[PDB]
Amino acid sequence: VMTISSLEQRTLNPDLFLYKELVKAHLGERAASVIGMLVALGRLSVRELVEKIDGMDVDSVKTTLVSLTQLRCVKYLQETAISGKKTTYYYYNEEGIHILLYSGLIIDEIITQMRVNDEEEHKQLVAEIVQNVISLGSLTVEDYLSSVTSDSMKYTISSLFVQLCEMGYLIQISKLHYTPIEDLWQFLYEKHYKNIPRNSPLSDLKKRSQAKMNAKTDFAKIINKPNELSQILTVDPKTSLRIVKPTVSLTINLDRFMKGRRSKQLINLAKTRVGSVTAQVYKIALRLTEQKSPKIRDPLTQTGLLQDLEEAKSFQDEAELVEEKTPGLTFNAIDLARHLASLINSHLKILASSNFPFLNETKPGVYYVPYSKLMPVLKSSVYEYVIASTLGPSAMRLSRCIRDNKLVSEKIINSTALMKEKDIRSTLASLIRYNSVEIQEVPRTADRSASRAVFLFRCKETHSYNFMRQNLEWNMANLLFKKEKLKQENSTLLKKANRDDLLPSELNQLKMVNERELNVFARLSRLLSLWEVFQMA
Amino acid sequence: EKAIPKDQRATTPYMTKYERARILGTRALQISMNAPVFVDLEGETDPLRIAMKELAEKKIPLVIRRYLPDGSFEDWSVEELIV
Amino acid sequence: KEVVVSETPKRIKGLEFSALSAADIVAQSEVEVSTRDLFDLEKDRAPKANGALDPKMGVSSSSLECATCHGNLASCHGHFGHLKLALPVFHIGYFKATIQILQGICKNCSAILLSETDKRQFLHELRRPGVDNLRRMGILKKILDQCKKQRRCLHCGALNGVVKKAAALKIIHDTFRWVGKKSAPEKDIWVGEWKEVLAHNPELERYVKRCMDDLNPLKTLNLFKQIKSADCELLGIDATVPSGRPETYIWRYLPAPPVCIRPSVMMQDSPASNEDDLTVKLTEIVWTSSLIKAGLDKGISINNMMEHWDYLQLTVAMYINSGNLSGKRVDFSGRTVISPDPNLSIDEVAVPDRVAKVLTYPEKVTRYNRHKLQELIVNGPNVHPGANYLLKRNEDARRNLRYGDRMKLAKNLQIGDVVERHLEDGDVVLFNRQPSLHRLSILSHYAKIRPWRTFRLNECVCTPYNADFDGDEMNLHVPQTEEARAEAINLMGVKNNLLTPKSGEPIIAATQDFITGSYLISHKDSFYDRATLTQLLSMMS
Amino acid sequence: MKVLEERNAFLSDYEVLKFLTDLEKKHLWDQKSLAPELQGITRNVVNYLSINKNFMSDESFAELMTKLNSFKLFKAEKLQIVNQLPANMVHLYSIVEECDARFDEKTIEEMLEIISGYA
Amino acid sequence: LMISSDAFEVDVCDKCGLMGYSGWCTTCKSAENIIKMTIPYAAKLLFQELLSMNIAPRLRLEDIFQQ
Amino acid sequence: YKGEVLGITRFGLSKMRDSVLQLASFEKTTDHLFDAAFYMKKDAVEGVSECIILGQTMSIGTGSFKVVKGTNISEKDLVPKRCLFESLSNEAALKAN
Amino acid sequence: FILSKIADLVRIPPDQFHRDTISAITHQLNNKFANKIIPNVGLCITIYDLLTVEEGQLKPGDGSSYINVTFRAVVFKPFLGEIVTGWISKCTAEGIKVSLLGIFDDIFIPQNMLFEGCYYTPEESAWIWPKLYFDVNEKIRFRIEREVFVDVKPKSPKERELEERAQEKPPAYALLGSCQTDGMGLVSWWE
Amino acid sequence: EFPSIPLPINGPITNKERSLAVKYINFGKTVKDGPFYTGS
Ligand SMILES: [Mg+2]
Ligand SMILES: [Zn+2]
Ligand SMILES: [Zn+2]
Ligand SMILES: [Zn+2]
C-alpha cells in the first residue's frame, strides 16, 4: 500500500519503456501505442497492428506510420511468399529513436565545430536549419527557402550549407536506411548463390567460401555510398560560386556523429596520464581525424554471423588492416597536427609511451591511434569509476583485484590491503547483485551441496557491461516519465500562457517548476554522456 | 447473429423432450410469480400441474430460439411445434 | 439529487491465466509481515498483532473484528499479505519452464540463439487461426530441439552447451561436452586460468576437476531481465500484457494467504490456541529471511550464507508442495433404510411423516394458493399439513412459525411472501443410492406421507437401483425451485425412463415374486370360477 | 445508460406544456382530482411554465410561427424569442444578437408591436 | 450444486478482473468497474488457492443480453 | 479424431481440452496449473465441467437453446409521433443565408 | 428542454403481463428516469415515445422479461440560457443563488463578472445603487455562462467509517452565469 | 522512503549549461507544434 516510491513500473517494462517514453513526449499518444507493439512483438503488418491495438483502425494506423517514417522511426521491408501476395512489413528503428533521444546534443556539437567566424552566424543560420532537419526529417533546399520573403541574404545559408556537408553530418536521404540490416544481407546472400550453375561439390558446399566472400565485396559499396560522395559534392557551375546540388533532399547521419561523440570520452581518458596542453594537442590531432575513422560496429557482423570461428577471427584481423591502410588518416605527421616543431613531437612521443592503448603502433615515426585495441580499456576505465563514485573506493579496489588475477580464491583478498571478514565479505554481497562477482562453487560431494564446497570468484565480462547498460537505460526511462507526470499540473498553466505572448503564489508555482523542469534535462545530458560508452564496442 | 426467416427454417418441426421440460418449467416459474393464466382451471395448486394443462391446450405465449453453432436464430414458435 | 443507477446481467466468458508480477502482489496486499514472526503475545488476551496473522488480514475468531471490512468470521472474504524476500529465490513449480526457457537462450548475450529465417518460419507457423494445445506444444518442441542442436550463437562470439539439472534444485550448465580442437578464444583463457589457479596453490583444486559452473538464481534473474519483449512468443510467454514476463516466475515477493484459508482448528476453547502448519512454515520463512538480511547488514564468516539460502530455497519449495472423492454438501436431504411396498405406484416413494416435516419446500403465494397457505400457516409446524418458516415480501426476516406470531400472521399474507411448507402428497422428489453406477441410479418420484420411519418403495423399480434390500440405505433430495422440479419429473422421472440406454432393453419391469405369481395363474391346470375370478379382478385394481 | 444522439430535436416550451397537459389525462387529473413519485415534477412544471401567461394559444402559436418567416435569423434565437418577449421597446437591447448592427429602431418597434398585440 | 449447496455473492471487476470485498478492487483503487454477481464458494476457495501461489486466474465478463 | 491414436491416461487428456479446471480433477496435480499459467492459455469457458465450477449453465442437454417471450407489438404503435415540431424551424433558417 | 434518444434494457416482472407492452415499458422507464440526474446529459423529466423494441429475452434464474428499448427522453438542459424566470434561493457573503422552482435549486452566480457598481454588506440586507433594488421574493432574470459536470466518484470502504462517526457535494448538473446587460436583472425594471 | 544509502552522486545542482536544456525544450515544443502530432 501507499505506492509513492514508483514501484509499479519495476517488473513490467525494461528496454521498451524508454522507447515508449521518448515518443510519448514527442509524437502524441497514438505513436506510443504502435511503437509499444513493434518492440513487444517483432515484425507485423498493417492489419496485424489493427487486430492487436484494439482501439485503432486502418485509418488510424496508416496515419501514424507516415509520421514515424518521416522521423525514420520505422523500417520498411516489402517481401512476398513463394505463391505470391506481396505485402508490406515494418520493423522498429532504434536510430530514429536515438535521434529523438539526443536532439539538442546534436546541436551542441554542430555549433562548436566551425572556425574563426564565431558568434555572428551560429544563432539563426545553422541553428535554425539543423533543428528543422532533426524535427521535420528529410528536407530539401527549395522547400525551405520559400519560407523567407525577399531573400537578399540568400547565399549566406549556402556557405554554411556547403561547409557542413563537407566534413560529415548532412547526407543523401534514406534510400538504404529504411531497409533493415538482416534482409540487406539475406537478399544478398541468395542473389549471388542462385546464379552459380551446377558444378563439382568439393566437400559438398564450397560456395560458403566463394559466394559469401562475393557478398562481402558488395557489402563494401553499400555502406560507402551514404558517406562522403562526389555526386552531391564538388559541383562547379560556369562563372559562378561553388555550390552543392540543391534539388534532392538531404538528412543527417548518425554514423559520423557517434564517432565524433567518442572523442569526448577519449579526451576524458586524456585527462588521465597527461596534463592539459598535451591533452589539447592530442585533442586537435584527434579532431583532425574524425570523419574518416572506422565507425562503431558495421552491419557486416551485426547480424547474419552464425559464429564461424575462422571468419570471426579474421574479421578483427582485417579491421587492423583497415586501420593500417587508410587514405590519409595514418598520416599524423608534424605538418598535419600543428597547423589545423620538436616540442610537439616530444609530447607525441609521450603519447606513444603513455601506455594506455592510444597513439601506439609506430614503426617509421608517423603515428596512429589504435581504435580497436582501446575499447576494452575505454569500457573498463569508466566502469571502475562508477562503483568508486557510487558504492565505494574499497569496492573498487576489490573489483579491480578480482581482475588483477583470474579467479581469485577465498583467502587471497584478505592477504591484500585489508584484514579479513570485516567488509571484504560484506561488499561482495553488495556486488553479486550487480553481475560483477559471478560466484562459482565446486564441491567434493556427490549432490553439489554448499557446506562441503569452495567458492571461486571470477569476474566474467559482458555481464557487468550489459547490466549497467540496462540500468542506465532504465534510469533514463525513469527520468522522462516523472517529467511528463509533473506536466499534468501545468495543463491549466502553460496552455493558458499563450494569450499574453500578478498573483505572487504563481511565482512559487510557475517560475518554481521551470528550474525543476530544467534540472532533469541538465542531468539527462550527463546520463547520456555516461551511457554511450557501453554501445561503442 | 443473423436471424433465419420463417420460410428458410431447416431444423426439425417436432418438439424435443429437452425443450418440452424447459418451456414447462419456465411457464411454471412465471405462474408462481403471479402471472395471468389462459386456461379454464379447476381449483388447485402446484403451477407445474396447471402448466401441463396449458401445454396440452397449446396456449403458452413463448417461442423457442434454437441456436446453430455460428448464430442462426431460427424463431420456432411454440404453437408450431407438435408432439 | 441522485443519479441513474444502471446494472446489467453479466456472466463469465473466460479465464486468462497468468502469473503475478512484483507489483501485482504488493498491489492486492494489505500489510507486509514487516520482518516479524513472534505473533506479539502480550498479557491481555494472548492476542494477534502487526507483523503476523493480524486483523488487517482475515479473522478466525468470534471476537476480534477485521476492521478493514467490519465483519465477523462469516462476513470476511479474506485479505492477502505480501512478503519480501532477500536474495530472490528459484521457483519449484516453474522448474521445467525455467529449464525450457534457459535451453533456448544464449547465456552471454541473453538472446535467442536461433537464426533469422528459421525464426521467421516458426513465427509464421505459430500464428495460424486454428491452433490447438497439442499443435502448439508440438511447434514449441520443434523449436526447442532445433535450438538445442545449435552450438554457436549469432549476436556474440560465445560458445553454448547443454543446461540440465544436477545429477536439490540446482541448475547446471555444460559449456564443453566434447574434446574438439576448434580455435575458440574462450577455452585458452579457461585453461590458462585453471593452470594459474593450480600453480598458485595446489591445495584447493587438486582433488577433482570438471564438476561444472554454477547457476545462481540471482544470476539467471538478471539473465531473464535482459532478453527482449519480442522473443517471448518463441518461449511460450504471450507478453503483450505487462502482467506476466519471463522473469516474473522467480520468487521475489510471496503472497501470504488470508486467515480464512488457514483457520484455527476447533480442537480448542482452551487458551493459547493452535494454528495450522502453513502459518508455521511462513513464520520460518520470515525467520530465515531475517537471518539473510542480518548477513547482508554486516559481513559474516563462512559459507553459511549460501547454505542458509539453499535451505530457504528448500523451505519455499516445501511450502507449496506436499483425490476425486465425494465433496459437495447439499441442503434438504435425508438418508434412510428401504422397505418393500407393492401397494404403491411405480412413480411413487412413500416418505414418513418424521422426515417430511423438516424437509420443506419454498412456495410463493399467488392468486391460486392463498386459500390453502392460510390454513397451512394456521396448522403450524407440528401438525403435518403445515409450515416451518416464512419469508416476507420486503424481507423483514425469516419468520419461523414457532415463537409467537399466531393465526393473525396468516391473515395478512402479502402476495410476494414465501412460505416453507412441509413435504406433502404429490411433491416431486429425487431418490438415490450411493454406489451410483449408471443413469438409472438416480430417478425421481412422487411423495406419499405414511407411518413407520422408512423409505419404502415398489419392487418393479428396485432393479435399476440394484436393491437387494437386507438393511440398505438410500438418499433422498428435494428440489428447491420451480424450474429444477419440472426437470426431475419430465425427462428424469420413472415413467419416462422405462428403458436402459445401454441397449434399449427394459431394465425396470416385473421382478422375482411377480414372475412366480404369474406362472401359477397362467399355468394350464388353473380353472377359475366367479367365486374366485371376481375376487382376482378386484384384487388387482 | 448509452446515448445515441445528444443534440436531437430542439423543442419549444409550449410543446412540453401541451405534452404534460395531455400526460395527466391518461390517468386521474391534477386540478380536477385535487379536491407514484413522478407526478411531483408533472404538477410542478405545468405550474411553473404557466407563470408568464398570466395577466386558444395552439393555433395562435401556429400563426405566430408562420408570422416569424418575415426576416431571417439563426437557429436558436427564434425559439428564444418565441418563448419570451413581453414586448416593450427595450427588450431587443438585451435579447437579439449583435444588438446595434443590422436593425433600425422602427423595424424592431413594429415587430415588438406585433408581439405585444399577440400576447 | 450451486444454489442449495454453496451459494455465495461476490464482486469482480471488469478491468484486471480479480475480486475484492463489496465496494473496492484493492488493485484498481478507483473502483468503479465493480460488478456484483453470484458464484459457488468452492470456486472462491479455488481462486484464492491459485492466487496464494503465483497463478492469476482472471475472470473475464460479458453481459448475457446483447441481441 | 486428432490424427493419431492417443487414449485416456496421464499424458492422454491433453487432446483438445484447454479446460485447466477440468484437467485439475486428475491425479498427479501441481503440474498442469503451472504450464497453463506459463504458456498463458486463453481458456474460454464452454465445457460442462468448468460451468459447474463457475456456476454457469451447461451448453448441452436442456441449456442448448433459449426461450424468449414475444412482445406481440406492431409497427403502428412504434411510430415517431410528431405535431408542429420542426415544421417551420427548419424553414426559417435557409431564407437567403 | 431537449429531446435526447438513448437506449437501455429494462425488466418487466411476470405480474405485469396483464397490461400491454407499451404501458408496461413506459411504467418501468419512469422508475429509473425520474428526478435521477443523468451523468453529463442533464436531467430527464418524462418519456416521450419509444421505437425499435426487440423480443423479450429471459435468463432462467429470474423468469421476468428483459426488453432492450430505444426511447426519446425529455431532458432539461439549456445550452446557453438567454433568460431564466426563476427567483431566489439564499444570500450569503458570496454571489446570489436562485431557484428555477419546481424541479431543482442549483443555479449560482459568483460575483466576478457581474455589475461592478454593486456590493454586498454583511448586515444580511443587500442594497445596491449604480434607482430601485433587486432583493428577495422576485423573479431574477439572467444569463447562463459556464456549465461543468462533476462526477459521482466513489469512496473507500475503510474511509466510510470516518464519514459515519462525525457526519456536502453538489450534483452533476451545475449551472452558472453573469449579469452585465443593462436592464437585465428584474422583470419590472422595464414596462 | 525505504532507501537512504551512500551517495548516488553525479547528481549535483550547479547546471552551468542552462541554454542546453532550453534547446531541448525548444526542440520539444517545435515537435509538439508540428504538422503531424498523432495525439490522443
Ligand atoms: Mg444388500
Ligand atoms: Zn476481513
Ligand atoms: Zn549470445
Ligand atoms: Zn481490477
Residue pair C264/C275 in contact (Cβ under 8 Å)? The answer is yes
Nearest CA in chain C to B49: C486
DSSP per-residue letters across chain F: --SS---SSTTTS-SS---HHHHTSSSS-SSHHHHHHHHT------SSTTTTTTTPPPSSTTSSSEEEB-----TTTS----SSSSTTTTGGG-TT-
* Domain shared by G24 and G59, yes or no: yes
DSSP characters for C137-190? HHHHHHHHHHHHT--B-SSS--B--EEEE-----EEEES--S------HHHHHH
Paired with A342 in beta bridges are none
Q: Which chain E residue has the Cα nearest residue F24?
A: E46
Q: How many CB pairs under 8 A join E and G?
A: 20
Chains G and F touch (3+ CB pairs under 8 A): yes
Q: Coil, strand or helix: which one is C428?
A: strand
CA of C473 to the centre of ligand 1 (A): 9
Nearest residue to A519 (alpha-carbon basis) of H25, F9, G65, C245: H25
Cα–Cα nearest to C13, from E66, F34, F37, A51: E66
Half-sphere exposure of G57 (CA within 13 A, CB side): 17
- Say if the Cβ atoms of C4 and G157 lie within 8 Å: no
- Is C109 known to sit in a ligand binding site? yes
Name which of C4, C8, C9 is nearest G36 (Cβ-Cβ). C4
Closest CA to E16 of E41, E33, E1, E2: E33
Secondary-structure percent of chain H, ordered helix, strand, coil, rounded to 5: 40, 0, 60
Q: Are residues G103 and G185 in the same domain?
A: yes
Locate the chain A residue with the closest alpha carbon to C154. Answer: A306
- Minimal Cα distance from G19: which residue of B? B36
The CATH number of whichever domain residue G69 belongs to comes to: 3.30.1490.120
Q: Does residue C405 sit in helix, strand or coil?
A: coil
In terms of domains, do G10 and G37 share one?
A: yes
Backbone angles phi, psi at F67, to 5 degrees: -110, 130
Of G14, G18, G55, the CB nearest to B30: G14
Residues G40, G108 within the same domain:
no
Say whether C232 counts as a known binding-site residue. Answer: no
Same domain for G71 and G143, yes or no, is no
Q: Choose among C340, C349, C348, C351: nearest CA to C511.
A: C340
Of G23, G46, G78, which residue constitutes the final position of a domain?
Answer: G78
**What is each CA distance from A92 to A44, C21, F97, in whole angstroms?**
10, 27, 53
Point out the domain boundary residue: G30, G63, G78: G78
Residues G89, G150 within the same domain? yes
Closest alpha carbon to F22 in F31, F7, F32, F12: F32
Sign of CA dihedral A368, A373, A376, A381: negative
Number of continuous H segments (helices) and E segments (strands) in chain A:
20, 6
Residues G40 and G84 in one domain: no
The rounded Cα C536 to chain-centroid distance in angstroms is 60
Comparing CB atoms, the residue among H25, H26, H37 nearest residue A28 is: H37
Whether E37 and C359 have beta carbons less than 8 Å apart is answered as no
Are B31 and B51 a contacting pair, CB within 8 Å?
yes
Q: How many other CB atoms are found less than 10 A from the CB of residue E14? A: 16
Can you spell out the DSSP letters for A383-441?
A: THHHIIIII-HHHHHHHHHHHHSSSB-STTTTTSSS-SSSSHHHHHHHHHTTTSS-EEE
Among C251, C36, C26, E20, which Cα is nearest to A5's?
Answer: C26
SS3 A176: coil
Same domain, G58 and G86: no
CA-closest candidate to residue E17, choices E40, E51, E49? E51
Alpha-carbon torsion angle C252, C253, C254, C257, nearest 10: -160
Q: Compute the distance from residue C66 Cα to the ligand 2 centre, in Å.
A: 5
Domain boundaries, chain B: 1-83
CA C160 / ligand 3 centre spacing (Å): 8
User: Mind telling me how many Å the CA of B7 is from chain G's nearest CA?
Assistant: 19
Resolution of the structure in the document, Å: 3.3
Sign of CA dihedral C337, C340, C344, C346: positive
For the stretch B45-49, contacts whose Cβ atoms lie closer than 8 Å and that sit 24 or more positions apart, written own/partner, are B45/C368, B45/C369, B45/C372, B46/C426, B47/C366, B47/C368, B47/C482, B48/B24, B48/C428, B48/C482, B48/C485, B48/C486, B48/C489
For residue C260, which amino acid is it? C
Q: How many Å apart are CA G157 and CA G171, to the nearest integer?
A: 21
The answer to whether the Cα torsion of G64, G65, G68, G69 is positive or negative is: negative
Phi-psi region of A392 (alpha: psi -120 to 50; beta: other; left: phi over 0): left
In chain A, residues with a C-beta closer than 8 Å to the C-beta of C170 are: 448
3-state secondary structure of A379: helix
Distance between CA atoms of C309 and C86, rounded to whole angstroms?
9
Helices within chain D (DSSP H only): 13-21, 39-48, 57-67, 76-82, 105-118
Grid cell 391446450 is found at B57
Q: Give the distance (Å) from ligand 4 centre to CA of residue E1.
A: 28
- Collect all residues with Cβ–Cβ distance below 8 Å to A489 and sequence separation of at least 6: A513
Distance (Å, whole) CA A257 – CA A291: 9
Which cell is C473 given? Answer: 440405505
Counted across chains A and H, CB pairs separated by less than 8 A come out at 84
Q: Are A215 and A185 in contact (CB under 8 A)?
A: yes
Pairing type for strands C442-450 and C348-352 reads parallel
- The whole-angstrom separation of Cα A231 and Cα A225 is 10
Residues of H with CB below 8 A from A522's CB? 15, 17-18, 20-21
Name the E strands within C313-454. 333-340, 348-352, 361-364, 387-391, 398-400, 418-421, 428-432, 442-450
Q: Please tell me the distance between residue E62's alpha carbon and the centre of ligand 2 in angstroms.
A: 28
**How far, in Å, CA of A253 to CA of C26, rounded?**
46
Q: What is the DSSP letter of D83?
A: T
Q: What gap in Å lies between CA C203 and CA C200, rounded to an integer?
A: 9
Breaks after residues in chain G, judged by C–N over 2.5 Å: 130, 167
Report CB contact under 8 Å: B25, C366.
no
Distance CA C173, CA C158 (A): 14
Identify the DSSP state of C342. T
Could you give the CA distance from residue C17 to residue D40 in angstroms, rounded to a whole number?
53
Contacts of D71 (CB under 8 A, 6+ apart): D107
Which of D11, D65, D72 is nearest residue F88 as measured by Cβ atoms? D65
- Other Cβ atoms closer than 10 A to A3: 11
- Any known ligand binding at E17? no
Q: Which of A104, A126, A101, A141 is nearest to A20 (CA)?
A: A101
Number of domains composing chain G: 2
Please check whether residue C388 is in contact with residue C487, taking contact to mean a CB–CB distance below 8 angstroms. Answer: no
Domain match, G33 and G15 both = yes
For B4-13, the CB contacts below 8 A with 24+ separation are B4/B72, B4/B73, B4/B74, B4/B75, B6/B75, B9/B74, B9/B75, B9/B76, B11/B66, B11/B74, B11/B76, B13/B80, B13/B81, B13/B82
Which candidate, G6, G9, G10, G69, places its Cα nearest to that of G39? G6
Contacts with C491 from chain F: Cβ below 8 Å: 62
Where does E1-67 have alpha helices with state H? Answer: 3-6, 41-52
DSSP code at position G86: B
Name the CATH superfamily for B1-83: RNA polymerase subunit, RPB6/omega (3.90.940.10)
Beta carbons of C483 and B26 less than 8 angstroms apart: yes
Q: Are F25 and C324 in contact (CB under 8 A)?
A: yes
Q: How many CA atoms lie within 13 A of C378 on its CB side?
A: 12
Give me the DSSP letters along A481-537. Answer: HHHTTGGGGSTTTTSSTTTT---TTTTTTHHHHHHHHHHHHHHHHHHHHHHGGGG--
- Other beta carbons within 10 angstroms of residue A255's beta carbon come to 20
CA of C472 to the centre of ligand 1 (A): 6
3-state secondary structure of C336: strand
The C-alpha angle with vertex A52 and arms to A49 and A53, in degrees rounded to 5, equals 80
Same domain, G64 and G90: no
How many angstroms from the chain centroid is the CA of residue A114?
Answer: 23
Residue identified by cell 500484457 is: C241
Q: Do C369 and B45 touch (CB under 8 A)?
A: yes
| Euclidean distance between CA atoms C400 and C452, whole angstroms | 27
Q: Record the cell numbers describing residue A356, joined without a space.
A: 594506455
The length of chain C is: 541
Q: In b/e form, how buried is each residue of A25-39, taking b as 16+ CB within 10 angstroms?
A: bbbbebbbbbbbbbb
Joined grid coordinates for residue H11: 547528481
CA distance E31 to chain F (A): 23
- Are the C-beta atoms of residues D57 and D14 closer than 8 Å to each other? yes
Looking at the fold, whether G187 and G111 belong to one and the same domain comes out as yes
**Alpha carbons A139 and A143: distance in angstroms, whole number:** 8
Q: Which domain holds residue G38?
A: 1-78
Q: Is E25 annotated as a binding residue?
A: yes
**Other CB atoms within 10 A of residue C219 CB:** 20
| Cell digits of residue C124 | 509464421
Residue A49 CA to residue A61 CA, distance in Å, equals: 7
Statement to judge: residues G140 and G68 lie in one domain: no
Q: At what angle do helices F32-39 and C95-103 cross, to 10 degrees?
A: 40
Q: How far, in Å, are C33, C36, C47, C66, G20 from residue C39 at the CA level?
A: 10, 8, 8, 16, 67
| Distance (Å, whole) CA D69 – CA D72 | 7
